[PDB]
């Protein structure tokens, strides 16, 4: 709702098309969007069905010159980018500027690893899919169709998770003392007046 300077979306557990449509409408309206962890996106349907769909996508190429044809990008970020570009008037100057407002990555590279990542409830797989339905992870599909850097991404991701865990341990230690201090300053004249106001 609020006009944010940059919106960083943790792409884990999101459905490809619904997130793509929401992000398309966001970036068309002048909002800068960065999606991280694109290999953690989800597509409804079993893995084999989506692999067959991507193989149908691969079969389409320009007959007279394979270099002129559709370019089938295998990286998960590029799969999300293809889905988003399908929902943008990308052949106009306005659509070009809107696509200039978008960034998509695998993992969480700098500087976005030290920023706040949000989610989109309208596109979250756990909130959208019926609990028994099968789904596919975009990282596995990308590896199955030719993406090469899954292991590097997972190694860098576990390194970043170790760093973030140390950060969160420090932050939780600091917050704990602040909560104790505010309790000491509770039941004081400022604290009593603030409670009657709703704070």
């Amino acid at each position: 709702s609020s006009f944010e300077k940059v919106v960083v979306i943790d792409g884990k557990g999101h459905l490809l098309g619904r997130l793509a449509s929401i992000v398309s409408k966001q970036i068309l309206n002048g909002q800068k969007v960065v999606v991280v962890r694109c290999e953690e996106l989800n597509i409804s349907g079993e893995f084999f069905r989506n692999k067959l769909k991507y193989h149908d996508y691969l079969r389409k190429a320009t007959r007279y010159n394979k270099k002129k044809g559709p370019f089938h990008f295998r990286a998960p970020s590029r799969i999300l980018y293809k889905a988003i570009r399908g929902m943008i008037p990308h052949k106009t100057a306005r659509g070009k500027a809107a696509l200039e407002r978008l960034k998509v990555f695998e993992g969480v590279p700098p500087p976005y690893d030290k920023k706040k990542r949000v989610v989109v409830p309208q596109a979250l797989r756990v909130l959208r899919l019926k609990p028994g339905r099968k789904y596919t992870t975009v990282g596995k599909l990308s590896s199955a169709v030719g993406w090469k850097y899954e292991s590097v991404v997972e190694k860098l991701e576990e390194k970043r998770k170790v760093q973030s865990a140390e950060y969160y341990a420090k932050k939780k230690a600091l917050t704990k003392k602040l909560n104790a201090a505010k309790a000491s300053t509770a039941e004081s004249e400022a604290a009593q007046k603030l409670a009657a106001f709703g704070y």
């Binding site: 709702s1 609020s2 006009f3 068309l28 309206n29 002048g30 306005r94 500027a97 809107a98």
Partner: protein
Amino acid sequence: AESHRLYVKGKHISYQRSKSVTNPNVSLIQIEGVASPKDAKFYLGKRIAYVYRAPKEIRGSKIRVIWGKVTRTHGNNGLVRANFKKNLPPKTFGASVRIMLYPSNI
């Protein structure tokens, strides 16, 4: 003292349009923090200023304004229709406008 804002942030979204034809005389404005027609009906009749910069100085200033007003709500998600004295150029699709707090009725 860090914030001096006396207006509500808005964005120029689009012209009034069907699938294929656009009407530049009506602009659709998204007001920040408004998501329902009940919320958007507070801003009906308020003034809108599009503030932009131009190459030539006019009386020592390189800042020009196009004025308008909120006329009605649009759809179900809190967008409003705005009428400007001069139609907002299409290059401003996505640009930010200022929803001024007057004429006040509070």
